[PDB]
Amino acid sequence: AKVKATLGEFDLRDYRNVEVLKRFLSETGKILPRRRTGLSAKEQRILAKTIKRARILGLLPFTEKLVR
Amino acid sequence: MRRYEVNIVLNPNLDQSQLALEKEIIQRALENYGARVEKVEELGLRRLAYPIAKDPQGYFLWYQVEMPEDRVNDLARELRIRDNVRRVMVVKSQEPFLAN
Amino acid sequence: PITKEEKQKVIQEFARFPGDTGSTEVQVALLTLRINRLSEHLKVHKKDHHSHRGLLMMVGQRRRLLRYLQREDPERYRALIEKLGIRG
Amino acid sequence: AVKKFKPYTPSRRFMTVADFSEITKTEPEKSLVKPLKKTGGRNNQGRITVRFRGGGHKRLYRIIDFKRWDKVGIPAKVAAIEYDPNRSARIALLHYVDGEKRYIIAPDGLQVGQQVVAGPDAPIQVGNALPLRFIPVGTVVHAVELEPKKGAKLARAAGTSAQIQGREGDYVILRLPSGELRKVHGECYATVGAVGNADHKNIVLGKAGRSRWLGRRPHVRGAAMNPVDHPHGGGEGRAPRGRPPASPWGWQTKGLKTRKRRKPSSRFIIARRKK
Amino acid sequence: QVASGRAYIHASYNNTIVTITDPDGNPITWSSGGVIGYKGSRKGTPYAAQLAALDAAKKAMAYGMQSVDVIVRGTGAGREQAIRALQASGLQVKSIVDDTPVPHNGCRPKKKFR
RNA sequence: UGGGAGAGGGUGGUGGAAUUCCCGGAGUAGCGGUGAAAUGCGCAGAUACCGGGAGGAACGCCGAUGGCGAAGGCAGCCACCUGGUCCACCCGUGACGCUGAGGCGCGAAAGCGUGGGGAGCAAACCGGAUUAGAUACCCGGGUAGUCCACGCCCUAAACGAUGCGCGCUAGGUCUCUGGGUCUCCUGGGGGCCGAAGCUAACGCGUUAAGCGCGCCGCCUGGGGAGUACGGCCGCAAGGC
Ligand SMILES: [Mg+2]
Ligand SMILES: [Mg+2]
Ligand SMILES: [Mg+2]
Ligand SMILES: [Mg+2]
Ligand SMILES: [Mg+2]
Ligand SMILES: [Mg+2]
Ligand SMILES: [Mg+2]
Ligand SMILES: [Mg+2]
Ligand SMILES: [Mg+2]
Ligand SMILES: [Mg+2]
Ligand SMILES: [Mg+2]
Ligand SMILES: [Mg+2]
Ligand SMILES: [Mg+2]
Ligand SMILES: [Mg+2]
Ligand SMILES: [Mg+2]
Ligand SMILES: [Mg+2]
Ligand SMILES: [Mg+2]
Ligand SMILES: [Mg+2]
Ligand SMILES: [Mg+2]
Ligand SMILES: [Mg+2]
Ligand SMILES: [Mg+2]
Ligand SMILES: [Mg+2]
Ligand SMILES: [Mg+2]
Ligand SMILES: [Mg+2]
Ligand SMILES: [Mg+2]
Ligand SMILES: [Mg+2]
Ligand SMILES: [Mg+2]
Ligand SMILES: [Mg+2]
Ligand SMILES: [Mg+2]
Ligand SMILES: [Mg+2]
Ligand SMILES: [Mg+2]
Ligand SMILES: [Mg+2]
Ligand SMILES: [Mg+2]
Ligand SMILES: [Mg+2]
Ligand SMILES: [Mg+2]
Ligand SMILES: [Mg+2]
Ligand SMILES: [Mg+2]
Ligand SMILES: [Mg+2]
Ligand SMILES: [Mg+2]
Ligand SMILES: [Mg+2]
Ligand SMILES: [Mg+2]
Ligand SMILES: [Mg+2]
Ligand SMILES: [Mg+2]
Ligand SMILES: [Mg+2]
Ligand SMILES: [Mg+2]
Ligand SMILES: [Mg+2]
Ligand SMILES: [Mg+2]
Ligand SMILES: [Mg+2]
Ligand SMILES: [Mg+2]
Ligand SMILES: [Mg+2]
Ligand SMILES: [Mg+2]
Ligand SMILES: [Mg+2]
Ligand SMILES: [Mg+2]
Ligand SMILES: [Mg+2]
Ligand SMILES: [Mg+2]
Ligand SMILES: [Mg+2]
Ligand SMILES: [Mg+2]
Ligand SMILES: [Mg+2]
Ligand SMILES: [Mg+2]
Ligand SMILES: [Mg+2]
Ligand SMILES: [Mg+2]
Ligand SMILES: [Mg+2]
Ligand SMILES: [Mg+2]
Ligand SMILES: [Mg+2]
Ligand SMILES: [Mg+2]
Ligand SMILES: [Mg+2]
Ligand SMILES: [Mg+2]
Ligand SMILES: [Mg+2]
Ligand SMILES: [Mg+2]
Ligand SMILES: [Mg+2]
Ligand SMILES: [Mg+2]
Ligand SMILES: [Mg+2]
Ligand SMILES: [Mg+2]
Ligand SMILES: [Mg+2]
Ligand SMILES: [Mg+2]
Ligand SMILES: [Mg+2]
Ligand SMILES: [Mg+2]
Ligand SMILES: [Mg+2]
Ligand SMILES: [Mg+2]
Ligand SMILES: [Mg+2]
Ligand SMILES: [Mg+2]
Ligand SMILES: [Mg+2]
Ligand SMILES: [Mg+2]
Ligand SMILES: [Mg+2]
Ligand SMILES: [Mg+2]
Ligand SMILES: [Mg+2]
Ligand SMILES: [Mg+2]
Ligand SMILES: [Mg+2]
Ligand SMILES: [Mg+2]
Ligand SMILES: [Mg+2]
Ligand SMILES: [Mg+2]
Ligand SMILES: [Mg+2]
Ligand SMILES: [Mg+2]
């Protein structure tokens, strides 16, 4: 179940697209590894950097408590 | 010049009048620094992922200005003086990068 | 940085004929432009040693052009350095 | 940037002088000076009450505006920055659009030709004065009043400053130059920025004569005296202190705290200086 | 006396500490490997954590508490056994969250952690 | 001329996690630590929990066998200033090239000077253990320093223990980054296995340690010794 398939077109540089970027995050709020996102090398760097801007604007979490 | 995107987060507990004055300070500041607003998007209240200034919400603004590159840092500094401005991110505008 | 317009103006001012974009005069002038703007950068950023290597490389590149232009036509050489105020 | 001398005399080897680089005017405003009455450290009884003082260079007193809330809303042009012999800071000549001229102490980075203004509406810019309650937390300030309308008392020496740390009711909390944390009333005025001439501290006088120019007469050690004179006086040959080191008047001088215990301002001081 | 509250499990390699708090986080009672009588390396065991969680739950239930939220910090041995001991105690475990502090690369750690 | 990727460099800002300390609350008999302990801390209220505050340093996930740099080395994010480098077009100049004794600049850490800063860590130091002993390894403390600015120092397992440039000599496979007609192909990087050949062997092998040319640096048995003397450099330590 890889993330990038479950989505149509999206801008890898849009730091405000919470609903899309939120999907590239572990349930604890961490950035998901490539094996879980299906992104290439070049795409994953863009995803990482725009996730980080989004967190700084308060739109994405830096970390989440792990609920069982 | 260059096109930038000015992101601003404000105190979510201001009345519409105080908010109007805060947008007035911002708009004149943009003007005073030679920022040419092209687009502008105002999303207002949004539940944040973490409390900013010990509050779970934030009032969001967004401007797709165009301005001379040597002044954007000073504009960022001036926009940040107001106690009611909680975040300012002046990012460079760039072409979208699309997957799928 | 240097703008596209700013560069073209230097090229036309030193082109040996219409559309010459690679003669010794154009190369030296182009390098003299970058050297001068980088020297001004280094005065403010005296700790930018990595960019300073850039400058020595440009300076050495411009130097070898001049040694060549000085060997092949002294009058063109003497005119070029004064048209740029070089004389090291 | 402090300036050095070549060692062409034994004293020039280490002597250093201020560069005086910010100074743009070498004469004071005639209407703003008055004679500074020298005391030699003597009081109205003619008794020395502060030892080892006198003989310094003649000085005129430059009248300094330590209120500024005097002239709310009235901007002024920074006409000049000048030397002041009576303080470590430099001073800045202000030309008010009023036509009135005044001196403030020169902040760091103040610029001749810039304008400054005082009041609750003033921009948060170097040289402007505002009540503490309108300056944002984190701002470093100088020339701070301690009580409303009593005049600037805090952070006036070269290079010093205070920082606003928080707000609590009518009061703001400052970190004073000493590191002390203190409540100061919000209606107290301050000037944004630190005091200039921050290289003052690095000056090496270089020779005994230079202290004398400043009116500092030689200081003689208690251990150099006789028992009539000083607790440390006397002994055959050199002597260690032979008792807790003491002042000429007998009180101890290594650690003994001397702030009055029941002082009313203690309710307003949060943390004593740490260094 | 309050029926709803929280149960904190601080579990390190040396010890397990259980703190039962009110809904707002104010401690009501607590226990640990040392409180149930162990000293030294012994109080870092899973059984030690078990007795600690029961002795804390019993004291908590003795002020009328019936449902707790469980917050777990640390990766010590007696961690899971403390969670069991809370469930199988009479207290209703209404949630489980691991709130272990992890630095985003913060202070240099001691020598033993390098 | 037109594009590209990147922890390349410099400056100014700025975000969150965590540690410590301080304050308010709530609570009580221990906490901490180890192979096991003790010193330490704690009823003068600690540990554990919640709220508030202060301050310094480092940036989790992304992150890789990855990328960049000449080397040292470079990792939150934003902006400005700036270097190197690749590709495509095949447009300009017409051998303008290679190397490089001296010189000049850069140069991890530790160290030094002046002045800041100081949370965590931690030489020296103090104490507890361990042990036959234990000036150690382990534990509890702890000052320089670690951090910033400016100026010095100029070392290293500064390593690929492999100087730079060019031409030539099977392929297979993985990967980064461009350009295609996008299967595939073709450039530039980063690895692995291997043709011929090389090598004392180990191994190298289009990223050569193969086959050749140019130029530089260096070796000539171990110890004495990177010592002594001289010289030059450094504030010193000490370097050449
Ligand atoms: Mg965008
Ligand atoms: Mg603000
Ligand atoms: Mg170049
Ligand atoms: Mg020449
Ligand atoms: Mg000199
Ligand atoms: Mg001198
Ligand atoms: Mg001199
Ligand atoms: Mg002499
Ligand atoms: Mg002398
Ligand atoms: Mg002078
Ligand atoms: Mg001066
Ligand atoms: Mg000066
Ligand atoms: Mg005069
Ligand atoms: Mg007069
Ligand atoms: Mg008169
Ligand atoms: Mg007087
Ligand atoms: Mg007097
Ligand atoms: Mg009298
Ligand atoms: Mg009398
Ligand atoms: Mg008398
Ligand atoms: Mg006296
Ligand atoms: Mg006297
Ligand atoms: Mg005098
Ligand atoms: Mg003065
Ligand atoms: Mg009051
Ligand atoms: Mg001075
Ligand atoms: Mg002095
Ligand atoms: Mg003295
Ligand atoms: Mg004396
Ligand atoms: Mg005597
Ligand atoms: Mg007498
Ligand atoms: Mg007597
Ligand atoms: Mg006596
Ligand atoms: Mg005596
Ligand atoms: Mg004696
Ligand atoms: Mg004597
Ligand atoms: Mg004697
Ligand atoms: Mg004597
Ligand atoms: Mg004596
Ligand atoms: Mg004597
Ligand atoms: Mg003696
Ligand atoms: Mg003594
Ligand atoms: Mg004696
Ligand atoms: Mg004695
Ligand atoms: Mg007294
Ligand atoms: Mg008072
Ligand atoms: Mg234990
Ligand atoms: Mg938390
Ligand atoms: Mg180009
Ligand atoms: Mg407390
Ligand atoms: Mg707390
Ligand atoms: Mg990693
Ligand atoms: Mg690598
Ligand atoms: Mg051609
Ligand atoms: Mg031709
Ligand atoms: Mg060379
Ligand atoms: Mg050399
Ligand atoms: Mg170095
Ligand atoms: Mg260092
Ligand atoms: Mg040092
Ligand atoms: Mg030393
Ligand atoms: Mg130092
Ligand atoms: Mg010294
Ligand atoms: Mg010891
Ligand atoms: Mg012994
Ligand atoms: Mg012993
Ligand atoms: Mg020991
Ligand atoms: Mg230790
Ligand atoms: Mg320690
Ligand atoms: Mg220390
Ligand atoms: Mg020391
Ligand atoms: Mg020291
Ligand atoms: Mg340095
Ligand atoms: Mg290596
Ligand atoms: Mg190499
Ligand atoms: Mg070697
Ligand atoms: Mg060779
Ligand atoms: Mg492609
Ligand atoms: Mg490389
Ligand atoms: Mg290749
Ligand atoms: Mg191989
Ligand atoms: Mg073979
Ligand atoms: Mg051979
Ligand atoms: Mg081939
Ligand atoms: Mg190959
Ligand atoms: Mg290679
Ligand atoms: Mg070989
Ligand atoms: Mg060589
Ligand atoms: Mg020998
Ligand atoms: Mg040596
Ligand atoms: Mg030697
Ligand atoms: Mg020698
Ligand atoms: Mg050597």
mmCIF file with all atom_site columns, C-alpha atoms in Angstrom, chain D residues 83-189:
data_model
loop_
_atom_site.group_PDB
_atom_site.id
_atom_site.type_symbol
_atom_site.label_atom_id
_atom_site.label_alt_id
_atom_site.label_comp_id
_atom_site.label_asym_id
_atom_site.label_entity_id
_atom_site.label_seq_id
_atom_site.pdbx_PDB_ins_code
_atom_site.Cartn_x
_atom_site.Cartn_y
_atom_site.Cartn_z
_atom_site.occupancy
_atom_site.B_iso_or_equiv
_atom_site.pdbx_formal_charge
_atom_site.auth_seq_id
_atom_site.auth_comp_id
_atom_site.auth_asym_id
_atom_site.auth_atom_id
_atom_site.pdbx_PDB_model_num
ATOM 1   C CA . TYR D 1 83  ? 32.607 63.339 22.810 1.00 0.00 ? 83  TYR D CA 1
ATOM 2   C CA . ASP D 1 84  ? 31.385 63.747 26.377 1.00 0.00 ? 84  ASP D CA 1
ATOM 3   C CA . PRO D 1 85  ? 34.117 63.844 29.064 1.00 0.00 ? 85  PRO D CA 1
ATOM 4   C CA . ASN D 1 86  ? 31.579 63.240 31.850 1.00 0.00 ? 86  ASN D CA 1
ATOM 5   C CA . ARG D 1 87  ? 30.498 59.719 30.803 1.00 0.00 ? 87  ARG D CA 1
ATOM 6   C CA . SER D 1 88  ? 31.714 56.663 28.922 1.00 0.00 ? 88  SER D CA 1
ATOM 7   C CA . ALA D 1 89  ? 29.017 56.832 26.276 1.00 0.00 ? 89  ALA D CA 1
ATOM 8   C CA . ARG D 1 90  ? 29.210 59.218 23.392 1.00 0.00 ? 90  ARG D CA 1
ATOM 9   C CA . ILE D 1 91  ? 26.450 61.790 23.050 1.00 0.00 ? 91  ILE D CA 1
ATOM 10  C CA . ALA D 1 92  ? 24.210 62.603 20.102 1.00 0.00 ? 92  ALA D CA 1
ATOM 11  C CA . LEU D 1 93  ? 23.034 66.101 19.226 1.00 0.00 ? 93  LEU D CA 1
ATOM 12  C CA . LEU D 1 94  ? 19.347 66.121 18.278 1.00 0.00 ? 94  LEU D CA 1
ATOM 13  C CA . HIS D 1 95  ? 17.738 68.880 16.188 1.00 0.00 ? 95  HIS D CA 1
ATOM 14  C CA . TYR D 1 96  ? 14.002 68.789 16.805 1.00 0.00 ? 96  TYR D CA 1
ATOM 15  C CA . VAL D 1 97  ? 11.763 70.072 14.020 1.00 0.00 ? 97  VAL D CA 1
ATOM 16  C CA . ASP D 1 98  ? 10.556 72.239 16.916 1.00 0.00 ? 98  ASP D CA 1
ATOM 17  C CA . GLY D 1 99  ? 13.844 74.078 16.621 1.00 0.00 ? 99  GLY D CA 1
ATOM 18  C CA . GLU D 1 100 ? 14.852 72.853 20.091 1.00 0.00 ? 100 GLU D CA 1
ATOM 19  C CA . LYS D 1 101 ? 18.251 71.197 20.388 1.00 0.00 ? 101 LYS D CA 1
ATOM 20  C CA . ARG D 1 102 ? 19.015 68.451 22.915 1.00 0.00 ? 102 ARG D CA 1
ATOM 21  C CA . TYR D 1 103 ? 21.577 65.784 23.753 1.00 0.00 ? 103 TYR D CA 1
ATOM 22  C CA . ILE D 1 104 ? 20.852 62.102 24.233 1.00 0.00 ? 104 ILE D CA 1
ATOM 23  C CA . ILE D 1 105 ? 23.429 59.434 24.881 1.00 0.00 ? 105 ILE D CA 1
ATOM 24  C CA . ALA D 1 106 ? 24.429 57.909 21.584 1.00 0.00 ? 106 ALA D CA 1
ATOM 25  C CA . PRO D 1 107 ? 23.046 54.396 20.950 1.00 0.00 ? 107 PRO D CA 1
ATOM 26  C CA . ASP D 1 108 ? 24.960 51.753 19.049 1.00 0.00 ? 108 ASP D CA 1
ATOM 27  C CA . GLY D 1 109 ? 24.478 52.133 15.312 1.00 0.00 ? 109 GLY D CA 1
ATOM 28  C CA . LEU D 1 110 ? 22.860 55.571 15.579 1.00 0.00 ? 110 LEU D CA 1
ATOM 29  C CA . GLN D 1 111 ? 23.398 57.473 12.333 1.00 0.00 ? 111 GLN D CA 1
ATOM 30  C CA . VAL D 1 112 ? 23.885 61.183 11.700 1.00 0.00 ? 112 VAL D CA 1
ATOM 31  C CA . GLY D 1 113 ? 20.972 62.359 9.606  1.00 0.00 ? 113 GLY D CA 1
ATOM 32  C CA . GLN D 1 114 ? 18.508 59.742 10.741 1.00 0.00 ? 114 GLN D CA 1
ATOM 33  C CA . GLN D 1 115 ? 15.429 60.857 12.632 1.00 0.00 ? 115 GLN D CA 1
ATOM 34  C CA . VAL D 1 116 ? 14.238 59.648 16.029 1.00 0.00 ? 116 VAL D CA 1
ATOM 35  C CA . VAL D 1 117 ? 11.070 60.276 18.043 1.00 0.00 ? 117 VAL D CA 1
ATOM 36  C CA . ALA D 1 118 ? 9.596  59.460 21.461 1.00 0.00 ? 118 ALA D CA 1
ATOM 37  C CA . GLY D 1 119 ? 6.131  58.228 22.395 1.00 0.00 ? 119 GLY D CA 1
ATOM 38  C CA . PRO D 1 120 ? 3.754  55.252 22.642 1.00 0.00 ? 120 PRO D CA 1
ATOM 39  C CA . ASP D 1 121 ? 3.413  55.299 18.821 1.00 0.00 ? 121 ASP D CA 1
ATOM 40  C CA . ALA D 1 122 ? 7.102  55.461 17.910 1.00 0.00 ? 122 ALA D CA 1
ATOM 41  C CA . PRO D 1 123 ? 8.513  52.798 15.574 1.00 0.00 ? 123 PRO D CA 1
ATOM 42  C CA . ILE D 1 124 ? 10.675 50.186 17.244 1.00 0.00 ? 124 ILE D CA 1
ATOM 43  C CA . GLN D 1 125 ? 13.915 51.662 15.894 1.00 0.00 ? 125 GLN D CA 1
ATOM 44  C CA . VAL D 1 126 ? 17.301 52.603 17.308 1.00 0.00 ? 126 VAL D CA 1
ATOM 45  C CA . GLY D 1 127 ? 17.138 55.950 19.064 1.00 0.00 ? 127 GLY D CA 1
ATOM 46  C CA . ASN D 1 128 ? 13.389 56.038 19.639 1.00 0.00 ? 128 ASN D CA 1
ATOM 47  C CA . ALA D 1 129 ? 12.052 56.155 23.175 1.00 0.00 ? 129 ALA D CA 1
ATOM 48  C CA . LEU D 1 130 ? 8.790  54.523 24.282 1.00 0.00 ? 130 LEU D CA 1
ATOM 49  C CA . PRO D 1 131 ? 7.160  53.429 27.539 1.00 0.00 ? 131 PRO D CA 1
ATOM 50  C CA . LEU D 1 132 ? 8.347  49.924 28.369 1.00 0.00 ? 132 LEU D CA 1
ATOM 51  C CA . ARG D 1 133 ? 4.856  48.437 27.963 1.00 0.00 ? 133 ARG D CA 1
ATOM 52  C CA . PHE D 1 134 ? 4.874  49.308 24.224 1.00 0.00 ? 134 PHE D CA 1
ATOM 53  C CA . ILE D 1 135 ? 8.322  47.884 23.409 1.00 0.00 ? 135 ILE D CA 1
ATOM 54  C CA . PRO D 1 136 ? 8.118  44.214 22.326 1.00 0.00 ? 136 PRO D CA 1
ATOM 55  C CA . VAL D 1 137 ? 9.519  41.406 24.456 1.00 0.00 ? 137 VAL D CA 1
ATOM 56  C CA . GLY D 1 138 ? 13.063 40.548 23.388 1.00 0.00 ? 138 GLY D CA 1
ATOM 57  C CA . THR D 1 139 ? 14.000 44.118 22.514 1.00 0.00 ? 139 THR D CA 1
ATOM 58  C CA . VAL D 1 140 ? 17.223 45.433 23.997 1.00 0.00 ? 140 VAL D CA 1
ATOM 59  C CA . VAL D 1 141 ? 16.931 48.927 25.374 1.00 0.00 ? 141 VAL D CA 1
ATOM 60  C CA . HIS D 1 142 ? 18.977 51.512 27.220 1.00 0.00 ? 142 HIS D CA 1
ATOM 61  C CA . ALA D 1 143 ? 18.452 54.699 29.209 1.00 0.00 ? 143 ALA D CA 1
ATOM 62  C CA . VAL D 1 144 ? 15.668 53.046 31.180 1.00 0.00 ? 144 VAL D CA 1
ATOM 63  C CA . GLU D 1 145 ? 13.754 54.901 33.840 1.00 0.00 ? 145 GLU D CA 1
ATOM 64  C CA . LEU D 1 146 ? 13.316 53.058 37.117 1.00 0.00 ? 146 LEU D CA 1
ATOM 65  C CA . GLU D 1 147 ? 10.114 54.892 38.083 1.00 0.00 ? 147 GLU D CA 1
ATOM 66  C CA . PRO D 1 148 ? 7.688  56.767 35.811 1.00 0.00 ? 148 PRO D CA 1
ATOM 67  C CA . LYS D 1 149 ? 8.794  60.345 35.030 1.00 0.00 ? 149 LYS D CA 1
ATOM 68  C CA . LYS D 1 150 ? 11.859 60.246 37.323 1.00 0.00 ? 150 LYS D CA 1
ATOM 69  C CA . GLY D 1 151 ? 14.382 60.096 34.465 1.00 0.00 ? 151 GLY D CA 1
ATOM 70  C CA . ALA D 1 152 ? 16.521 57.391 32.881 1.00 0.00 ? 152 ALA D CA 1
ATOM 71  C CA . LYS D 1 153 ? 18.610 55.569 35.518 1.00 0.00 ? 153 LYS D CA 1
ATOM 72  C CA . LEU D 1 154 ? 19.520 52.195 34.001 1.00 0.00 ? 154 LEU D CA 1
ATOM 73  C CA . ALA D 1 155 ? 21.908 51.100 31.257 1.00 0.00 ? 155 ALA D CA 1
ATOM 74  C CA . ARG D 1 156 ? 23.658 54.380 30.462 1.00 0.00 ? 156 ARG D CA 1
ATOM 75  C CA . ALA D 1 157 ? 27.337 53.360 30.401 1.00 0.00 ? 157 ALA D CA 1
ATOM 76  C CA . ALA D 1 158 ? 29.131 52.555 27.150 1.00 0.00 ? 158 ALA D CA 1
ATOM 77  C CA . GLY D 1 159 ? 28.095 49.242 25.625 1.00 0.00 ? 159 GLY D CA 1
ATOM 78  C CA . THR D 1 160 ? 25.474 48.406 28.237 1.00 0.00 ? 160 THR D CA 1
ATOM 79  C CA . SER D 1 161 ? 21.824 47.531 27.675 1.00 0.00 ? 161 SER D CA 1
ATOM 80  C CA . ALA D 1 162 ? 18.807 45.916 29.280 1.00 0.00 ? 162 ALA D CA 1
ATOM 81  C CA . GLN D 1 163 ? 16.520 43.325 27.696 1.00 0.00 ? 163 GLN D CA 1
ATOM 82  C CA . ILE D 1 164 ? 12.763 43.005 28.080 1.00 0.00 ? 164 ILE D CA 1
ATOM 83  C CA . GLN D 1 165 ? 12.014 39.458 29.229 1.00 0.00 ? 165 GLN D CA 1
ATOM 84  C CA . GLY D 1 166 ? 8.278  39.474 29.883 1.00 0.00 ? 166 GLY D CA 1
ATOM 85  C CA . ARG D 1 167 ? 5.213  41.341 31.057 1.00 0.00 ? 167 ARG D CA 1
ATOM 86  C CA . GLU D 1 168 ? 3.370  40.985 34.361 1.00 0.00 ? 168 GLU D CA 1
ATOM 87  C CA . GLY D 1 169 ? 0.478  43.343 35.065 1.00 0.00 ? 169 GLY D CA 1
ATOM 88  C CA . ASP D 1 170 ? 1.516  46.992 35.261 1.00 0.00 ? 170 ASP D CA 1
ATOM 89  C CA . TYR D 1 171 ? 5.176  45.892 35.258 1.00 0.00 ? 171 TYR D CA 1
ATOM 90  C CA . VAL D 1 172 ? 7.674  44.560 32.747 1.00 0.00 ? 172 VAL D CA 1
ATOM 91  C CA . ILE D 1 173 ? 10.566 42.260 33.602 1.00 0.00 ? 173 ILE D CA 1
ATOM 92  C CA . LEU D 1 174 ? 14.050 43.307 32.506 1.00 0.00 ? 174 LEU D CA 1
ATOM 93  C CA . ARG D 1 175 ? 17.456 41.674 32.521 1.00 0.00 ? 175 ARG D CA 1
ATOM 94  C CA . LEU D 1 176 ? 19.649 44.542 33.719 1.00 0.00 ? 176 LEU D CA 1
ATOM 95  C CA . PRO D 1 177 ? 23.276 45.030 32.583 1.00 0.00 ? 177 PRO D CA 1
ATOM 96  C CA . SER D 1 178 ? 24.388 43.257 35.789 1.00 0.00 ? 178 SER D CA 1
ATOM 97  C CA . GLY D 1 179 ? 22.288 40.186 34.953 1.00 0.00 ? 179 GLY D CA 1
ATOM 98  C CA . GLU D 1 180 ? 19.762 41.042 37.664 1.00 0.00 ? 180 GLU D CA 1
ATOM 99  C CA . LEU D 1 181 ? 16.120 40.350 36.819 1.00 0.00 ? 181 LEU D CA 1
ATOM 100 C CA . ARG D 1 182 ? 13.836 43.150 37.881 1.00 0.00 ? 182 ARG D CA 1
ATOM 101 C CA . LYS D 1 183 ? 10.271 44.337 37.548 1.00 0.00 ? 183 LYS D CA 1
ATOM 102 C CA . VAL D 1 184 ? 10.164 47.899 36.177 1.00 0.00 ? 184 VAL D CA 1
ATOM 103 C CA . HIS D 1 185 ? 6.926  49.838 35.785 1.00 0.00 ? 185 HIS D CA 1
ATOM 104 C CA . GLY D 1 186 ? 5.465  49.660 32.288 1.00 0.00 ? 186 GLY D CA 1
ATOM 105 C CA . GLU D 1 187 ? 5.017  53.440 32.096 1.00 0.00 ? 187 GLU D CA 1
ATOM 106 C CA . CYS D 1 188 ? 8.795  53.854 32.463 1.00 0.00 ? 188 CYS D CA 1
ATOM 107 C CA . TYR D 1 189 ? 10.498 55.104 29.314 1.00 0.00 ? 189 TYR D CA 1
#
